Design a protein around this ligand. Sequence first.
Ligand SMILES: [Mg+2]
Length: 195
Amino acid sequence: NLNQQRLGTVVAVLKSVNAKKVIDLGCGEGNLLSLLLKDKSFEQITGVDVSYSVLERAKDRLKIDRLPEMQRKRISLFQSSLVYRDKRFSGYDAATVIEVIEHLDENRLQAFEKVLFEFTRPQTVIVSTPNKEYNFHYGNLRHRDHRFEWTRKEFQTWAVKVAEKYGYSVRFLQIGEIDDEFGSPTQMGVFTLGA
Ligand SMILES: [Mg+2]
């Protein structure tokens, strides 16, 4: 329920900017989608993932085929490699990117940046990713490997550059309790279209 607070923060930011149509790029099992559906202010909720299997799990977890008609019309899910200009990315007020960028290599990240800030180009973009430094402060072996997480400097440097490259302004947030010098477990950049 630690992630529940993180996702809750994303929802609050969206509401704070009055976003009514939201697209979650890399929706996974739809944990954010679930929270969005609980707030009637969100008129269109769209989840996108690279994996067919994941999306199938999401729809099962969201029990979409059981939701009332009015609720079913608010949500949409579809598969995408997040590399090409897909017309289905257009028209949203905000795009959310949670647990995505820290998994992309140089080529895929650059491609995703275009898709996000040039193709989708919503008024607000919310990017959330782990603060690697948090793990510096001393159970699956692979899950214990945090080398691919970004430090706060790496994330902010990246955010500032893309914001500048695509005509967005960006601000940073610290999600979770701050551990003095190691920072919080999660870092978030909120991008706003325009300078
Ligand atoms: Mg996600």
